[PDB]
Amino acid sequence: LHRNSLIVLADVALFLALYHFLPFEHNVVLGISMLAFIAVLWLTEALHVTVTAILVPVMAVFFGIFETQAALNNFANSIIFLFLGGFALAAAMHHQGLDKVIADKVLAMAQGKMSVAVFMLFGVTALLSMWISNTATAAMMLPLVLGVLSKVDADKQRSTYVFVLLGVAYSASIGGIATLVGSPPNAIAAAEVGLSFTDWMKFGLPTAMMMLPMAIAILYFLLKPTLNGMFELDRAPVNWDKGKVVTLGIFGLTVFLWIFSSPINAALGGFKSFDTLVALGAILMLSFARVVHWKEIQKTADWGVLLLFGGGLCLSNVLKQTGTSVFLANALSDMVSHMGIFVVILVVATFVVFLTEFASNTASAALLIPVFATVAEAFGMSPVLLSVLIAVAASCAFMLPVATPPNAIVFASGHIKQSEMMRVGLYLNIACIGLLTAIAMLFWQ
Amino acid sequence: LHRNSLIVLADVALFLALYHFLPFEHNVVLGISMLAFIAVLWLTEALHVTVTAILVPVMAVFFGIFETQAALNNFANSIIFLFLGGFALAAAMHHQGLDKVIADKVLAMAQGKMSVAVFMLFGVTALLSMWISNTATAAMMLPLVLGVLSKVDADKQRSTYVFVLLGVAYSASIGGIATLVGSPPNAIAAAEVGLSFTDWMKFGLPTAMMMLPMAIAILYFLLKPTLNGMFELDRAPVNWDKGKVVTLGIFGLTVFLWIFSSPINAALGGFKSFDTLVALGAILMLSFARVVHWKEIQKTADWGVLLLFGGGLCLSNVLKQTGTSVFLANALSDMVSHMGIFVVILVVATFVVFLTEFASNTASAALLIPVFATVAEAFGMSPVLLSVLIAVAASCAFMLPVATPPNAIVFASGHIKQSEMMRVGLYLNIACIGLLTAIAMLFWQ
Ligand code: NA
Ligand code: NA
Ligand code: NA
Ligand code: NA
C-alpha cells in the first residue's frame, strides 16, 4: 500500500526472476541474485539500513552459503568496535558539554564580524564532524547557525544566509572525510581492507584539508555579501570545569595513540587490531575517570550503523564464497583492459559522487565497497585505492537533499531553495571528481 | 574520591598483589587474578556491568591470552542475536500498544473485586516478564499497580497494599525465569552451554509455574486483608487498531516456531542456531509488516546486556586457555568427591539464592556461570545442570532492595519498610532452595 512496501515486493520478484532465469552455475546465480536484491534495498532504502544488513546473514545461512555462526562473526569485526570507541568518545564530550564550549571559545574569537563568523562556523563544523558524526554535527550546528544569523536577520539578504546554512552542511560532510571515525563509509573501507586509523588519515586528512576550502570558495563566489553584518553575543560564558581537562586530556591521549599506533604497537609486541584496543581503552578510561556514564554511550551510539558494518562484511564474504566476485571481474575483463587506471579511478569517482546524491553516504558505500573491492581482488589489484576512493567520493553529497541528512537538515530551514542547492552542488561535484582523481593518482606510488 | 572509585582502586591493588605473589603456573595466576578482578567489579559494580564485560577482552589480548579479533569474536555469539530478536519483538508490540490491551481485556475481566484484583496484577506482571524483562516489567507495571490501590487507598491498610507492591516486584523476577528471553541470566546459561529456546522452557517454564504461587501464598498468608475492597475501572478502553493483530500474529508465529523448532529444523536440513534464525526473522517480519521502526527497536534494546553476554563468554574462554578452570577442579577434587550430587546442587542453589541478594541477578550469573561451568567440564560433568540451576537461582532476589531493580522499584515508593521485605524474602529464599533442589534433583533421572 506504501511506496516502500512495493519496492520490497517488486524486489522480491526481481530476485525470484534473476534467480530462475540467469543461465550460469548456481553458485554465481545465487550471488548475483542476492547482490541485486541488497543493492536495490540499500539504494531505495524501502527498509531501514540495518534491517537490510540483518537480512544479509539470514540469507547467506538459509541458502547454504555459510553456517549461522560463521556469518554472524562478521558483526564482531574489530573495526566495528573501533567505531564504537568513536561514539563513546563523542558521547563523553557532549554529555560533558565540551562540544558546546568548543563552539563558544571559537565564535568569541570573532569579536563581532559576521565575516569572521560564518567562516568560523564552517571550521568548527568540519572539526567537530571529525569525531562526532555528520548528521549529529549538523543538528548540533544548525541552531548555532540560525542564532548568529539573527542580528543581520534580513532574509532579503538571503545569499549571506544560505551561504552560511549550506556552508555548514558541506563542512559536516567534508569534515567526516578526515578520520576513520567521522562517517560510516570510512569504517566500511577499513573493515573491508583492514586499514589503520593513521592509514586512512594519510589519505583522508589532506584530502579534507583541501576539499573544505575548495567548497566554501564555490559558495562564496556566487552571491556572498558577508563582508557586512554584526554580532549579538547573547549567552553565558564557558569555563573548564570538572575533568573537561580530563576528558580533553583523555581524548588527546587517545588520538595520540591512534596517530602513533605504528611504533607504539611494534614496541609492545605487535598486537593485532591495535587501533581497536586503543578505542576500547578509551571507553575504559572515560568510565574509571567517572566522566561519562554508560547510558550516555548507549544513547549516543548508533547501533544500527554497527549492525550495518556486519552486513557489508558478510556481503563481501558472500560475493567471494559464491565466486560472484570473479564472475563479475570476467565480464569486465575486456572493458577494463580497454581502460587505463586513470580512466578506471576517474569512472569510479564520477559514478559514486553522483550515485551518492540519490542515497545515503553509508548506504552507498555499504553496497559499492563490497562489490568493487572483491572485484578488484579478482583483477589481482590491492583494494585499498578503490576502497579509500569510494569511501571519500561517497561523502561528496552536495546537490539535492536526500543525499545526506545534513542536506535535509539545513533544508528543513524552509529558507534554502531546492534549485539553489541543486546547482551549487553540480559545480562542487565536478570540482571533487577532479581533486579526487588527482589525489588518487598521486596516492599510487 | 567516590566510593566506587575506591573499590576499583582496591581491586586494582588486589590484582597486582595476586599477580606477583601467588605461587602457581603463570597462566593459572593470570586466570586467578583476572577471575578475582572481574568477580569484584561485577559484584560491587564500581564500574558498569557492561564496562567490565569490555574489560575482559582487552585484558585477554594484552596478557597474550588471545589475539584481538579472536577475543572480540565472542561478542557475536548466536545467543546475543537471539536476545536481540526478543527486544525487537517487545519494542514492536509496545509501540503497537499490544501490552495495554492485554491488561484491559484481562483486568476488566476482573469485574471489580479487590480479591480478584491483586490476584490479576500478579499474573499480568509475571506473564509480561516472560518476554520483555524484569526491570522493565516493574517500571511499566508500578503505575498500573498503584492505580488499583486507590479505592482501598488507606496506607493504614498497608498490609493490603504492601502485599500488592512486593507481590508484583517479585512477579517481575519470577516471570523472567519462564523463557530464554526474560532475564539475562537465562541467556547467559544458554550461551555457555548452547541451549535452545524450547530447552530452557522445559526447565524454566515448569519451575516458574510453581514458584509464582509459592511466592504469592507467602504474601497472602501473612498480613493480607485484600479479600475486601472495590474497583474503579477508570480509563478509556482500547481497541484492536493498526496492525496490533499483525504484531500479535508475527509474535505468535515466532513463539510457535520456537517451541516447535526441534522438529521443524530437523525436517529442514538441520540449520545451526535455528532459534537465532527465528529471532532475526521476527526482526524482519516486524519490519516488512511495518509494525515497528528501527529507532523503536534501537531504543527498546538493551545493548549493554548484549555486550555483557560477550564479556562472560570471553571470560569463560580465559579460564580454559590459562587452565584455571582445571586448576580449580583439582582443588575441589577431594571436596567434591567427598560430596554427593545432592550435596552439590543443594549447596550451589543456596549459595546463589543468597548471593544474588548483594548483586544484580545478571551480574551474578555473569560471574558464576563461567566458573562453575568450566570447572564442571574438568570433572567430566555436563555443565547444563549447574548452569540452568545457577541461572534460575540467580533470579531469586526477594529480600532487601539492590538485589534486583524490581525490588528497588516498588521499594522507592517510600511505603514498604526495610525490615518487611528483608524478612519476607529471607523466608521465601529458603522455600526456593528447597523447591529448586527438588526440581533440580528430579531433573536428573
Ligand atoms: Na564526526
Ligand atoms: Na549520500
Ligand atoms: Na523478561
Ligand atoms: Na540479584
CSV table of N, CA, C and O in Angstrom, one decimal, chain B residues 359-422:
chain,number,residue,atom,x,y,z
B,359,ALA,N,24.0,-8.5,44.7
B,359,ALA,CA,24.4,-8.0,43.4
B,359,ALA,C,23.2,-8.3,42.4
B,359,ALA,O,22.3,-9.1,42.7
B,360,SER,N,23.3,-7.7,41.2
B,360,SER,CA,22.3,-7.9,40.2
B,360,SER,C,22.1,-9.3,39.9
B,360,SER,O,23.0,-10.1,40.1
B,361,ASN,N,20.9,-9.7,39.5
B,361,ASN,CA,20.7,-11.0,39.0
B,361,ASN,C,21.6,-11.4,37.9
B,361,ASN,O,22.3,-12.5,37.9
B,362,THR,N,21.7,-10.6,36.9
B,362,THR,CA,22.6,-10.9,35.7
B,362,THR,C,24.0,-10.8,36.1
B,362,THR,O,24.9,-11.6,35.6
B,363,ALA,N,24.4,-9.7,36.8
B,363,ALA,CA,25.8,-9.6,37.3
B,363,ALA,C,26.3,-10.8,38.0
B,363,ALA,O,27.5,-11.1,38.0
B,364,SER,N,25.4,-11.5,38.7
B,364,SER,CA,25.7,-12.7,39.4
B,364,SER,C,26.0,-13.9,38.4
B,364,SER,O,27.0,-14.5,38.5
B,365,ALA,N,25.0,-14.1,37.5
B,365,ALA,CA,25.2,-15.2,36.5
B,365,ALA,C,26.4,-14.9,35.6
B,365,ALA,O,27.0,-15.9,35.1
B,366,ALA,N,26.7,-13.7,35.4
B,366,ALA,CA,27.9,-13.3,34.5
B,366,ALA,C,29.2,-13.9,35.1
B,366,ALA,O,30.1,-14.3,34.4
B,367,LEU,N,29.3,-13.9,36.5
B,367,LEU,CA,30.5,-14.4,37.1
B,367,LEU,C,30.4,-15.9,37.4
B,367,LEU,O,31.4,-16.6,37.3
B,368,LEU,N,29.3,-16.4,37.9
B,368,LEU,CA,29.2,-17.8,38.4
B,368,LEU,C,29.1,-18.8,37.3
B,368,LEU,O,29.7,-19.9,37.3
B,369,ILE,N,28.3,-18.5,36.2
B,369,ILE,CA,28.1,-19.4,35.1
B,369,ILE,C,29.4,-19.8,34.5
B,369,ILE,O,29.7,-21.0,34.3
B,370,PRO,N,30.3,-18.9,34.1
B,370,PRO,CA,31.6,-19.3,33.5
B,370,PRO,C,32.4,-20.2,34.4
B,370,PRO,O,32.9,-21.2,34.0
B,371,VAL,N,32.6,-19.8,35.7
B,371,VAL,CA,33.4,-20.6,36.6
B,371,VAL,C,32.8,-22.0,36.8
B,371,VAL,O,33.5,-23.0,36.4
B,372,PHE,N,31.7,-22.1,37.4
B,372,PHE,CA,31.1,-23.4,37.6
B,372,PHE,C,31.0,-24.3,36.4
B,372,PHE,O,31.2,-25.5,36.5
B,373,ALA,N,30.7,-23.7,35.2
B,373,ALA,CA,30.6,-24.5,34.0
B,373,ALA,C,31.9,-25.1,33.6
B,373,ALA,O,32.0,-26.3,33.3
B,374,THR,N,32.9,-24.3,33.5
B,374,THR,CA,34.2,-24.8,33.0
B,374,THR,C,34.8,-25.7,34.0
B,374,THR,O,35.6,-26.7,33.6
B,375,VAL,N,34.6,-25.5,35.3
B,375,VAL,CA,35.1,-26.5,36.3
B,375,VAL,C,34.4,-27.8,36.2
B,375,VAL,O,35.0,-28.9,36.3
B,376,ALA,N,33.1,-27.8,36.1
B,376,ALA,CA,32.3,-29.0,35.9
B,376,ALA,C,32.8,-29.8,34.7
B,376,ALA,O,32.8,-31.0,34.7
B,377,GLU,N,33.2,-29.1,33.7
B,377,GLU,CA,33.8,-29.8,32.5
B,377,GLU,C,35.1,-30.5,32.8
B,377,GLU,O,35.3,-31.6,32.3
B,378,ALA,N,35.9,-29.9,33.6
B,378,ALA,CA,37.2,-30.6,34.0
B,378,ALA,C,36.9,-31.8,34.8
B,378,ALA,O,37.6,-32.8,34.7
B,379,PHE,N,35.8,-31.9,35.6
B,379,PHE,CA,35.4,-33.1,36.2
B,379,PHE,C,34.7,-34.0,35.3
B,379,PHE,O,34.2,-35.1,35.8
B,380,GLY,N,34.6,-33.8,34.0
B,380,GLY,CA,33.9,-34.6,33.1
B,380,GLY,C,32.4,-34.6,33.3
B,380,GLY,O,31.8,-35.6,32.9
B,381,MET,N,31.9,-33.5,33.8
B,381,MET,CA,30.4,-33.4,34.0
B,381,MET,C,29.8,-32.5,33.0
B,381,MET,O,30.4,-31.5,32.6
B,382,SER,N,28.5,-32.8,32.7
B,382,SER,CA,27.8,-31.9,31.8
B,382,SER,C,27.5,-30.6,32.5
B,382,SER,O,26.8,-30.6,33.5
B,383,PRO,N,27.9,-29.4,32.0
B,383,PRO,CA,27.7,-28.2,32.7
B,383,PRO,C,26.2,-27.6,32.6
B,383,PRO,O,26.0,-26.5,32.9
B,384,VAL,N,25.3,-28.4,32.0
B,384,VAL,CA,23.9,-28.0,31.9
B,384,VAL,C,23.3,-27.8,33.3
B,384,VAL,O,22.8,-26.7,33.6
B,385,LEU,N,23.3,-28.8,34.1
B,385,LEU,CA,22.7,-28.8,35.4
B,385,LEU,C,23.0,-27.5,36.2
B,385,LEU,O,22.2,-26.7,36.6
B,386,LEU,N,24.3,-27.4,36.6
B,386,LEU,CA,24.7,-26.2,37.4
B,386,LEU,C,24.3,-24.9,36.7
B,386,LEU,O,23.9,-24.0,37.4
B,387,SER,N,24.5,-24.8,35.4
B,387,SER,CA,24.2,-23.6,34.7
B,387,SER,C,22.7,-23.2,34.8
B,387,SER,O,22.4,-22.1,35.4
B,388,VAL,N,21.8,-24.0,34.3
B,388,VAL,CA,20.4,-23.8,34.4
B,388,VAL,C,20.0,-23.4,35.9
B,388,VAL,O,19.3,-22.4,36.2
B,389,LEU,N,20.4,-24.3,36.8
B,389,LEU,CA,20.2,-24.0,38.2
B,389,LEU,C,20.7,-22.6,38.6
B,389,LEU,O,19.9,-21.8,39.1
B,390,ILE,N,22.0,-22.4,38.4
B,390,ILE,CA,22.6,-21.1,38.8
B,390,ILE,C,21.8,-20.0,38.1
B,390,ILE,O,21.5,-18.9,38.8
B,391,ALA,N,21.5,-20.1,36.8
B,391,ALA,CA,20.8,-19.1,36.1
B,391,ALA,C,19.4,-18.9,36.7
B,391,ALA,O,19.0,-17.7,36.9
B,392,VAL,N,18.7,-19.9,37.1
B,392,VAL,CA,17.4,-19.8,37.7
B,392,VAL,C,17.5,-19.3,39.1
B,392,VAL,O,16.8,-18.3,39.5
B,393,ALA,N,18.3,-19.9,39.9
B,393,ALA,CA,18.5,-19.5,41.3
B,393,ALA,C,19.0,-18.1,41.4
B,393,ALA,O,18.8,-17.4,42.4
B,394,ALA,N,19.8,-17.6,40.4
B,394,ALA,CA,20.3,-16.2,40.4
B,394,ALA,C,19.2,-15.2,40.3
B,394,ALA,O,19.3,-14.1,40.9
B,395,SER,N,18.1,-15.6,39.6
B,395,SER,CA,16.9,-14.7,39.5
B,395,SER,C,16.0,-14.7,40.7
B,395,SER,O,14.9,-14.2,40.7
B,396,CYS,N,16.5,-15.3,41.8
B,396,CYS,CA,15.7,-15.4,43.0
B,396,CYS,C,16.1,-14.3,44.1
B,396,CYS,O,16.6,-14.7,45.1
B,397,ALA,N,16.0,-13.0,43.8
B,397,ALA,CA,16.3,-12.0,44.7
B,397,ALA,C,15.0,-11.4,45.3
B,397,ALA,O,14.3,-10.7,44.6
B,398,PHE,N,14.7,-11.8,46.5
B,398,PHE,CA,13.5,-11.4,47.2
B,398,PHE,C,13.6,-10.6,48.4
B,398,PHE,O,12.7,-9.9,48.8
B,399,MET,N,14.8,-10.6,49.1
B,399,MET,CA,14.9,-9.9,50.4
B,399,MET,C,15.0,-8.4,50.1
B,399,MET,O,14.1,-7.8,49.5
B,400,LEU,N,16.1,-7.8,50.6
B,400,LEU,CA,16.3,-6.3,50.6
B,400,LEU,C,16.2,-5.8,49.1
B,400,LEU,O,16.3,-6.6,48.2
B,401,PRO,N,16.1,-4.5,48.9
B,401,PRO,CA,16.4,-4.0,47.6
B,401,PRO,C,17.8,-4.2,47.1
B,401,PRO,O,18.5,-5.0,47.7
B,402,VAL,N,18.2,-3.5,46.0
B,402,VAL,CA,19.6,-3.7,45.5
B,402,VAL,C,19.9,-5.1,45.1
B,402,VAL,O,20.9,-5.4,44.5
B,403,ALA,N,18.9,-6.0,45.4
B,403,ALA,CA,19.0,-7.4,44.9
B,403,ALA,C,18.7,-7.4,43.5
B,403,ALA,O,19.4,-8.0,42.6
B,404,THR,N,17.5,-6.9,43.1
B,404,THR,CA,17.0,-6.7,41.8
B,404,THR,C,16.5,-5.3,41.6
B,404,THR,O,16.1,-4.7,42.6
B,405,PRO,N,16.4,-4.8,40.4
B,405,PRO,CA,15.8,-3.5,40.2
B,405,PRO,C,14.3,-3.5,40.6
B,405,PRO,O,13.8,-2.6,41.2
B,406,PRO,N,13.6,-4.6,40.1
B,406,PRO,CA,12.2,-4.7,40.5
B,406,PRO,C,12.0,-4.5,42.0
B,406,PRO,O,10.9,-3.9,42.4
B,407,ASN,N,12.9,-4.9,42.9
B,407,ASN,CA,12.8,-4.6,44.3
B,407,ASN,C,12.9,-3.1,44.5
B,407,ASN,O,11.9,-2.5,45.1
B,408,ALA,N,14.0,-2.5,44.1
B,408,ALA,CA,14.1,-1.1,44.4
B,408,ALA,C,13.0,-0.2,43.7
B,408,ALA,O,12.8,0.9,44.1
B,409,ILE,N,12.3,-0.8,42.7
B,409,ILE,CA,11.3,0.0,42.1
B,409,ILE,C,10.1,0.1,43.0
B,409,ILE,O,9.6,1.3,43.3
B,410,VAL,N,9.5,-1.0,43.5
B,410,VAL,CA,8.4,-0.9,44.4
B,410,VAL,C,8.8,-0.4,45.8
B,410,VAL,O,8.0,0.0,46.6
B,411,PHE,N,10.1,-0.5,46.1
B,411,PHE,CA,10.6,0.0,47.4
B,411,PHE,C,10.7,1.5,47.4
B,411,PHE,O,10.4,2.1,48.5
B,412,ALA,N,11.2,2.1,46.4
B,412,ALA,CA,11.3,3.6,46.3
B,412,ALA,C,10.0,4.3,46.5
B,412,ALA,O,9.9,5.5,46.6
B,413,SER,N,8.9,3.5,46.5
B,413,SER,CA,7.5,4.1,46.8
B,413,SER,C,7.5,4.6,48.2
B,413,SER,O,6.5,5.2,48.6
B,414,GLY,N,8.6,4.5,48.9
B,414,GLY,CA,8.7,5.0,50.3
B,414,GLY,C,7.7,4.4,51.3
B,414,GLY,O,7.5,4.9,52.4
B,415,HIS,N,7.0,3.3,50.9
B,415,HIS,CA,6.0,2.7,51.7
B,415,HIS,C,6.3,1.4,52.4
B,415,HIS,O,6.0,1.2,53.5
B,416,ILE,N,7.0,0.5,51.7
B,416,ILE,CA,7.4,-0.8,52.3
B,416,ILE,C,8.7,-0.6,53.0
B,416,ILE,O,9.6,0.2,52.6
B,417,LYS,N,8.8,-1.2,54.2
B,417,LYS,CA,9.9,-1.0,55.2
B,417,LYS,C,11.0,-2.0,55.0
B,417,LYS,O,10.7,-3.2,54.7
B,418,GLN,N,12.2,-1.6,55.1
B,418,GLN,CA,13.4,-2.4,55.1
B,418,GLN,C,13.1,-3.8,55.8
B,418,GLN,O,13.3,-4.8,55.2
B,419,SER,N,12.7,-3.7,57.0
B,419,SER,CA,12.5,-5.0,57.8
B,419,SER,C,11.5,-5.9,57.1
B,419,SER,O,11.7,-7.1,57.1
B,420,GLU,N,10.4,-5.3,56.6
B,420,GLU,CA,9.4,-6.1,56.0
B,420,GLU,C,9.9,-7.0,54.9
B,420,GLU,O,9.9,-8.2,54.9
B,421,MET,N,10.4,-6.3,53.8
B,421,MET,CA,11.0,-7.1,52.7
B,421,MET,C,12.1,-7.9,53.1
B,421,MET,O,12.3,-9.1,52.6
B,422,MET,N,13.0,-7.4,53.9
B,422,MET,CA,14.2,-8.1,54.3
B,422,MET,C,13.9,-9.5,54.9
B,422,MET,O,14.8,-10.4,54.9
